[PDB]
């Protein structure tokens, strides 16, 4: 009982869950509607270097109107595949 209580009232375990949902599961509007809206404006060698996709996030969080907290950081917008070239697939991860 003192171990579980130590998590909530001191390390904010209840916050992390209700925060990752704001970012990963796209619950908070004006963020997915601003992240996906930016990426979809482009569509190969572009849109793949850490100069645009590693920076589009730091431009996305400003338009969130919810976040910009110590929780809001640590959103590594990385990738896991190098696309060559009408389909419905664009592989890209987003890890807390």
């Amino acid at each position: 009982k003192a171990a579980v209580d130590y998590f909530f009232v001191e390390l904010h375990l209840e916050a992390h869950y209700e925060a990752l949902r704001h970012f990963l599961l796209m619950e908070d509007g004006e963020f997915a509607q601003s992240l996906s809206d930016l990426l979809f404006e482009k569509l190969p060698g572009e849109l793949l270097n850490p100069l645009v996709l590693n920076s589009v996030l730091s431009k996305a969080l400003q338009c969130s109107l919810h976040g910009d907290t110590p929780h809001a950081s640590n959103l590594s917008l990385a990738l896991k595949y190098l696309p060559e070239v009408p389909d419905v697939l664009s592989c890209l991860e987003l890890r807390y």
Binding site: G29, E30, H66
Partner: protein, 369 residues
């Protein structure tokens, strides 16, 4: 994306005022336009607080109100005055337009009951399609020589406004029944409530419908059948709300079927039962939809203002709205036989009769082609 409002005539400036009172109450904004101590994105309507209002006699009393720190009778004459101040007034719109980050739409609060604004409303929509072709326009028109000024503005609203009707007749029925008034500032108390909850999904972020194009694109199927009606039940679980909404005793309007419904729930209700209420509404068959395409009903949740109980709004596109027009245009033919070219009144009567044909054709199982 920022939203801006325009209020015309005597009516629009009155309900828009109480619309500004009720909305300013939702957030912790003092009457003096200053935030008090006491999540909610207040940037879509307010600009650092300053509201994006544009007011076009009663204005004197409006400044005489404690909210001062918050900023003829014919149709052709109302159209003439709009031309005499064409450039003078428009500068306010432009300077507020690009001074804003990204304009999304134009909320229009006006009346069509023979007022100078009624013509004034007809002019602005023509120019709003002239200058800005990429800006949506929404209008919360209100219904009552009165046949003349009413049917004319309908000619402009059916081709300029891409999207909410409110008839004073069905409102006063609610007034005498559940408020027992037997005034103007009495019925608008409920009217401002409809508009306030109409933008619950905009001021508070949610998953779906985070923009004005997110609400309208689903309901309006074609640029012609672009008329909506509203419902607001709280005047208790989910099956209580949606069932009290579909009754004709609550609708703000004086075969037939629906095309699309939208129900906004503002409470903290248990979201586990929202699918159950959907089953009971289907099985009892309390509402009827179109036969041709698969038409459904959609519901989304949001949270009330924590500063201020389960509320709910119902937004619908019912083909019964065609009857209201028939009441109007019928009066025109009677006034056409009883009393420089009088040709604009012809094409106006002509184009609405195309719309009344477009509604009656949507209720047939072979509406396509």
């Amino acid at each position: 994306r920022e939203i801006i409002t325009l209020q015309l005539g005597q009516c629009g400036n009155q309900i828009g005022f109480e619309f500004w009172k009720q909305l300013c109450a939702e957030h912790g904004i003092s009457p003096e336009g200053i935030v008090e101590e006491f999540t909610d994105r207040k940037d879509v309507f307010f600009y650092q607080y300053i509201p994006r209002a544009v007011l076009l006699r009663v204005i004197h009393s409006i400044l005489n109100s404690p909210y001062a720190k918050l900023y003829g009778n014919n149709w052709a004459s109302g159209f003439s005055q709009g031309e005499k101040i064409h450039e003078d007034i428009f500068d306010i719109i432009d300077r507020e337009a690009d001074g804003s980050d990204s304009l999304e739409g134009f909320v229009l609060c006006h009346s069509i009951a023979g007022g100078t604004g009624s013509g004034l409303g007809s002019y602005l929509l023509e120019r709003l399609n002239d200058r800005y072709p990429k800006k949506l326009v929404q209008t919360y028109s209100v219904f009552p020589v009165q046949p003349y000024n009413s049917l004319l503005t309908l000619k402009r609203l059916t081709q300029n406004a891409d999207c909410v009707v409110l008839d004073n007749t069905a409102l006063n029925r609610i007034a005498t029944d559940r408020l027992h008034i037997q005034s103007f500032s009495q019925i608008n108390q409920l009217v401002s409530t409809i508009m306030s909850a109409s933008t619950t999904t905009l001021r508070y972020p949610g998953y779906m419908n985070n923009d004005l194009i997110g609400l309208i694109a689903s309901l309006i199927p074609t640029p012609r059948l672009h008329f909506l009606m509203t419902g607001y039940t709280p005047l208790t679980t989910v099956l209580d709300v949606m069932r009290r909404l579909l009754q004709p005793k609550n609708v703000m309007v004086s075969n037939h079927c629906y095309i699309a419904i939208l129900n906004i729930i503002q409470g903290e209700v248990d979201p586990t039962q929202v699918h159950k209420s959907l089953q009971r509404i289907r099985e009892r068959k309390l509402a009827n939809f179109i036969p041709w395409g698969p038409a459904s009903i959609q519901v989304a949740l949001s949270r009330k203002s924590p500063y201020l109980r389960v509320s709910g709004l119902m937004m619908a596109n019912h083909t019964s709205i065609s009857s209201l027009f028939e009441r109007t245009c019928r009066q025109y033919d009677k006034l056409r036989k009883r009393e420089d070219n009088f040709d604009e009144m012809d094409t106006s009567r002509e184009i609405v009769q195309q719309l009344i044909d477009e509604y009656h054709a949507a209720t047939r199982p072979d509406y396509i082609s």
